[PDB]
Design a protein around this ligand. Structure first.
Ligand SMILES: *[C@@H]1O[C@H](CO)[C@@H](O[C@@H]2O[C@H](CO)[C@@H](O)[C@H](O)[C@H]2NC(C)=O)[C@H](O)[C@H]1NC(C)=O
Ligand SMILES: *[C@@H]1O[C@H](CO)[C@@H](O[C@@H]2O[C@H](CO)[C@@H](O)[C@H](O)[C@H]2NC(C)=O)[C@H](O)[C@H]1NC(C)=O
Ligand SMILES: *[C@@H]1O[C@H](CO)[C@@H](O)[C@H](O)[C@H]1NC(C)=O
Ligand SMILES: *[C@@H]1O[C@H](CO)[C@@H](O)[C@H](O)[C@H]1NC(C)=O
Ligand SMILES: *[C@@H]1O[C@H](CO)[C@@H](O)[C@H](O)[C@H]1NC(C)=O
Lengths: 92, 170, 336, 96, 48
């Protein structure tokens, strides 16, 4: 409650930002999964996606989404990352 | 997705081509390449950017910051204080700690002092500020900042054939 | 008559650290998780503040010996002795002697003065200069209390006192005495009768002037001759660069960016990654602080030795063998 | 004080009480929390010991200087300038 | 001798031999034990 003569240090200071810049700036096909007989597990059918914009919930809403289990990824985060590199294998 | 306006010269949340963060940006003299789209530095930090639309080069520089020091003559004597913002031109600061500035702004080489008056005299250093500047509390009384003095001035009467011998001791 | 030189470090660079910006940055969740720790940054701040004040104490102890400012007489005649190579030069804007200029132009500092003030690293200027890159992580360099225009004044006062009043100014009032009699006093001190000087004054003056010119010339045409004063700067720069570069490590986490762990994932498994990164960076800071403490202790020992040499060799005549130069000691002159 | 004040930190664990960590959950996943606490406490002890060693070295240097001053200024008369007081030294007296 | 003797410590891991961990347990959980062991050995070297 009492301090002596001198100079002390206290909490730092920072300059806050004001506005928000955004200068971000297609519809690739999902047909081969819907078309044709789904093969078995040893003959899984693979599709590679690149430089496109995808839509997962549009495709999954058509089906009956039973179970969803992942590793190093989650369904919450699977619809948020960038295109990067993407490969989907479907089978019966 | 969508797009927004393009602002410059104010350190705000930038989001050039996805990359987010904060920083002020000015003009630059540097050449990207047609296959080059993103800058880097000596320590894995973005330096320059190319507009994804306008296709020119800008830069990145986070907002100013630094420490805060409080100079006080002791609560026993008075309750006035002075504030030193280390390493920041305060003509360019106007957020954290005190949200209200004041008057009597003095610019030093170790930051700038708020709430202290600069005089032209020279006394011994009481509270060391730095870079040859010291501060004290003196007379109506207030806090002042000055340049420390090294001592008294005298010259020895050196001569060809003159010698001074003491006549008494202590 | 021989004139030798001795170089001694006196102080290192003051530094300050900030955990809030270095450890986490602009993330509030990481700040909360750091607040979860009891106290691992009060000690670091206290240690760095102690080192910072110790550096100023070292400089003040070494240089601020006499609380007077003596001035040499306007007429520079000292019985044939010719001290123009160590006394201040009024022609230059800086008040440094023609020898201190050589010592200043042979050591490459990081940034003479402090004009950055976060107003120079604008645009492409940032991230190219080393100083800006260090300053943009949370590490700052504080300026010394005594500028370079006051140490020169102190050394000039010491020189004027020791060439106009002998050693009598270090033990009370200053008493003047002609230089060709102070020389006789010192010659009688080392064990030679004083008539030798009074009969060989011209030869002794010529030898002294030749020695001064020789050292002035040889201080330049030499490979390093100043490694002791360069090692401090090199070590500080290397330590700061390593501390800055340590941020790029992963420490076993999935990513090195704090914005891809709090987001892009879920809390219950992101806590482990954030904890790993925080622990790694804290350990790096602790290592840096301990190294700084040890180096500060060594510099303190060197500064104590320098203060002892200044008190004994300059302000008097020393009978200790090989302490103030090699041979039979006559006197010494300081430079910054 | 700092050392004692370091005993109220869970170091990322769910709690800072050993009995609480042991109970309410299965010991196989209690082992990681226990090891976290042990590592934190060991780091605190190591830091304390290192700083004590440095301070001991500093005190030893001061004690050596004091012993030298006692041997030279007190037991005799020294001609070293400013070693045993400003001026021309005459004699010294010690006090505890 | 202390530095040499310190090599035989679990450091909270499942085993002190790098072959025994790389033989039965899948890498996802072996990484944790290896990280603990490496961190402990780094601490030993730093203290030395
Ligand atoms: C040397 O200095 C001392 C200290 O002032 C002188 O002692 C004083 O002498 C006169 C005698 O009447 C008075 O001013 C004081 O009574 C003395 N002071 C003390 C403390 O005794 C001394 O006289 C001086 N010596 C000479 C030769 O002048
Ligand atoms: C003292 O030393 C200086 C430095 O050598 C001497 O100044 C030189 O004088 C000669 C003759 O006038 C010039 O050719 C040199 O250029 C001077 N040197 C410099 C560095 O300017 C000086 O003569 C010596 N003696 C006196 C009495 O000053
Ligand atoms: C602070 O900014 C102003 C901008 O007008 C500049 O003129 C001044 O030199 C700056 N201060 C320092 C100490 O450089
Ligand atoms: C101090 O000096 C400056 C410039 O030399 C002058 O402008 C100012 O009025 C002086 N202040 C006082 C109080 O003398
Ligand atoms: C006295 O000093 C001046 C210095 O220029 C000069 O007259 C002479 O060299 C000196 N010695 C004398 C006059 O005996």
């Amino acid at each position: 409650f009492t301090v002596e003569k001198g100079i002390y240090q206290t909490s730092n200071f920072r300059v806050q930002p004001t506005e928000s810049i955004v200068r971000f700036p297609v519809e690739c096909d999902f047909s081969p999964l819907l078309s044709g007989t789904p093969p078995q597990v040893y003959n899984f059918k693979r599709l590679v996606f690149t430089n496109c914009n995808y839509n997962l919930t549009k495709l999954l809403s058509l089906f009956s989404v039973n179970d969803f289990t992942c590793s190093q990824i989650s369904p919450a985060a699977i619809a948020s990352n960038c295109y990067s590199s993407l490969i989907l294998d479907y089978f019966s | 997705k969508k797009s927004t306006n393009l602002v410059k010269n104010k350190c705000v949340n930038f989001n050039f081509n996805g990359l987010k963060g904060t920083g002020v940006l000015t003009e630059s003299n540097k050449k990207f390449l047609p296959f080059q789209q993103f800058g880097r530095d000596i320590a894995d930090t973005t330096d320059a950017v190319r507009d994804p639309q306008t296709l020119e080069i800008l830069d990145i520089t986070p907002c100013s910051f630094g420490g805060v020091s409080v100079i006080t003559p002791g609560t026993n004597t008075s309750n006035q204080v002075a504030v030193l913002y280390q390493g920041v031109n305060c003509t360019e600061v106007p957020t954290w700690r005190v949200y209200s500035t004041g008057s009597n702004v003095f610019q030093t080489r170790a930051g700038c002092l708020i709430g202290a008056e600069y005089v032209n005299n020279s006394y011994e250093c009481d509270i060391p500020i730095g870079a040859g500047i010291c501060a004290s509390y003196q007379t109506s009384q207030s806090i002042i900042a000055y340049t420390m003095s090294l001592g008294a001035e005298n010259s020895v009467a050196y001569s060809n054939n003159s010698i001074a011998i003491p006549t008494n001791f202590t | 008559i021989s004139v030798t030189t001795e170089i001694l470090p006196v102080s290192m660079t003051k530094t300050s650290v900030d955990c809030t910006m270095y450890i986490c940055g602009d993330s509030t969740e990481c700040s909360n998780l750091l607040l979860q720790y009891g106290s691992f940054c009060t000690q670091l701040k206290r240690a760095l503040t102690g080192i910072a004040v110790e550096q100023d104490k070292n400089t003040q102890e070494v240089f601020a010996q006499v609380k007077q400012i003596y001035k040499t007489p306007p007429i520079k005649y000292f019985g044939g002795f010719n001290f123009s190579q160590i006394l201040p030069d009024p022609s230059k804007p800086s008040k440094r002697s023609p020898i201190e200029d050589l010592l200043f132009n042979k050591v490459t500092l990081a940034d003479a003065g402090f004009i950055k003030q976060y107003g120079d690293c604008l645009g492409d200027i940032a991230a190219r200069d080393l100083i800006c890159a260090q300053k943009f992580k949370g590490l700052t360099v504080l300026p010394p209390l005594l500028t370079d225009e006051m140490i020169a004044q102190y050394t000039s006062a010491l020189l004027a006192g020791t060439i106009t009043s002998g050693w009598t100014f270090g033990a009370g009032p200053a008493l003047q005495i002609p230089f060709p009699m102070q020389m006789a006093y010192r010659f009688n001190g080392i064990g030679v009768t004083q008539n030798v000087l009074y009969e060989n004054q011209k030869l002794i003056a010529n030898q002294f002037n030749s020695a001064i010119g020789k050292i002035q010339d040889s201080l330049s045409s030499t490979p390093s001759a100043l490694g002791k004063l360069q090692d401090v700067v090199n070590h500080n720069a290397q330590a700061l660069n390593t501390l800055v570069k340590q941020l790029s490590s992963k420490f076993g986490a999935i990513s090195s960016v704090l914005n891809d762990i709090f987001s892009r994932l879920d809390p219950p498994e992101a806590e482990v990654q954030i904890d790993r990164l925080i622990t790694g960076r804290l350990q790096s800071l602790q290592t840096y602080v301990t190294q700084q403490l040890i180096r500060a202790a060594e510099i303190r020992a060197s500064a104590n030795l320098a203060a002892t040499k200044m008190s004994e060799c300059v302000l008097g005549q020393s009978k200790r063998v090989d302490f103030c130069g090699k041979g039979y000691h006559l006197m010494s002159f300081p430079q910054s």
